[PDB]
């Protein structure tokens, strides 16, 4: 239970841009989405819903 | 799926099953016309000429 939490909770996900891959006619903003990304402290580690 | 009235929901009913490419990121045209190409580069030491 502890192990399998420190996994989900502390991991590194993926999430497309906005345009990039084939978009719609006349689009304008392409940006990069930034989803889940690794904890970086004993603090954030301290806090894991177990 | 297979909904309660027992119909069918297959991909045609949710995904537009097409046939494009891996990336939609490189768009190229020769003489203002839609084209593809390959950037043939020189193996180290072999003769550009040969």
- Encode B6-49 in three state secondary structure: CCCCCHHHCCCCCCCCCCCCCCCEECCEECCCCCCCCCCCCCCC
Length, in residues, of chain A: 50
As a whole number of angstroms, the distance between CA B39 and CA B1 comes to 45
Under 8 Å CB pairs connecting chains A and B tally to 7
DSSP SS3 for B5: coil
Tokens at residue A35, please? Answer: 């989803």
CB A29 within 8 A of CB A3: no
**Structural contact between residues A18 and A31, judged by C-beta atoms closer than 8 angstroms:** yes
Approach to solving? X-ray
State CA B38 to chain mean position distance: 15
First to last CA, chain B: 59
Compute CA A27 distance to the chain's CA centroid, rounded to the nearest angstrom: 25
Q: How far is B18 from chain A (nearest CA, A)?
A: 13
DSSP chain A: --HHHHTTTS-B-----SSSSS--TT----------B---SHHHHH----
Look at A20 and B24 and tell me if their CB atoms are within 8 Å.
yes
Specified resolution (Å): 3.1
B11 closest CA partner among B22, B25, B1, B21: B1
* Cα distance from N-terminal residue to C-terminal residue, chain A: 7
């Amino acid at each position: 239970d502890v192990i399998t939490a420190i996994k989900a909770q502390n991991a590194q996900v993926a999430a497309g841009q906005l345009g990039g891959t084939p978009p719609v006619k006349g689009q304008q903003l392409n940006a990069s989405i930034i989803a889940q990304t690794r904890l970086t402290s004993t603090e954030e580690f301290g806090k894991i819903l177990l | 799926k297979v909904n309660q009235d027992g119909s069918r929901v297959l991909l045609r009913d949710v995904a537009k099953i097409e046939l494009g490419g891996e990336n939609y990121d490189i768009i190229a045209e020769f003489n203002g016309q839609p084209a593809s190409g390959l950037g043939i580069k020189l193996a180290t030491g072999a003769n550009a000429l040969d």
